[PDB]
Amino acid sequence: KPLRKLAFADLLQATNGFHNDSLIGSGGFGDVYKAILKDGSAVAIKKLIHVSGQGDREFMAEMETIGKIKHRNLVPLLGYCKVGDERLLVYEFMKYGSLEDVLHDPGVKLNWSTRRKIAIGSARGLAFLHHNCSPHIIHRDMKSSNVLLDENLEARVSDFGMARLMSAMDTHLSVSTLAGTPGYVPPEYYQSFRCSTKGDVYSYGVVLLELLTGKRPTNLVGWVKQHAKLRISDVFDPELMKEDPALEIELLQHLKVAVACLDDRAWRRPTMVQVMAMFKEIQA
């Protein structure tokens, strides 16, 4: 499954001249269209914004990361269009959209057994990025809106527009600007222009809180750490306890994973491999 170079004309007609009816997300980072290629492929087409600046760097960021690897828990980049001032990226369509859209209902009710699979799945995706890839890949924008869900509701990490490569001989990578989303930014990212895999782990933690709490990050991490000083049986998603109050024991342990990821000290945070190992220790 090689990275296809798609003609701009194909993408143009597949979206009916980039018509509004095909649009499923715009502005901010990229314009996204739901489309069917002339071979019948169900895809998502991102039309990049502000080329020859933030846009072109974003393009190469994805091309050099997600575009050169494949993994069960990473949204596959199927193709690209680099023509003139136009930058487009083509992905496999994710049926049930983003985790954020689902946790913040317009939808599909997520029971705990599926939420924990989403957590394990997303965790495995980042683990692959941090440990299996050389150079390592720092995502730098892990969040619920960048966790997509296929037909099987398995998590697939998306949006490598701000991702960067780091040698395995380095603990951190020094950047040019502060990247991330409010509510997800690692506290140490505010103190210096440096990013790291531990930074990704922090951001992952927030997502794990969203799955546990059911709340938006906007902070969530703050009073959770403060209610951790009080009674922990007060923060979990109400709809989770309705299913069975017996699974509250693994919830707390899963909460113990989330809080470790969210430590202000980057050195104290677990690696995503340790996170995976911790997830495995809970059920079996």
Side-chain angles (χ1 to χ4, degrees), residues 228 236-242 244-251 253-274:
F236 291 114
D237 195 323
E239 293 295 334
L240 291 183
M241 290 294 186
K242 293 181 181 180
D244 200 339
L247 45 77
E248 78 171 285
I249 176 61
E250 65 169 324
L251 286 184
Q253 290 181 322
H254 279 75
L255 179 58
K256 288 173 183 184
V257 183
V259 296
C261 294
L262 289 167
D263 201 286
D264 291 36
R265 308 158 296 186
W267 65 270
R268 193 69 168 262
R269 299 185 190 125
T271 70
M272 292 313 299
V273 171
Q274 282 172 316

Side-chain angles (χ1 to χ4, degrees), residues 12 77 87 90-91 133 137 168 172 193 209 247-248 275:
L12 183 64
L77 181 55
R87 308 291 181 181
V90 186
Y91 315 80
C133 297
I137 302 180
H172 73 272
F193 295 104
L209 274 201
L247 45 77
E248 78 171 285
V275 171

Side-chain angles (χ1 to χ4, degrees), residues 78-81 83-84 86-92:
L78 299 177
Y80 65 98
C81 188
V83 164
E86 296 294 318
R87 308 291 181 181
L88 297 99
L89 294 163
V90 186
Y91 315 80
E92 178 180 342

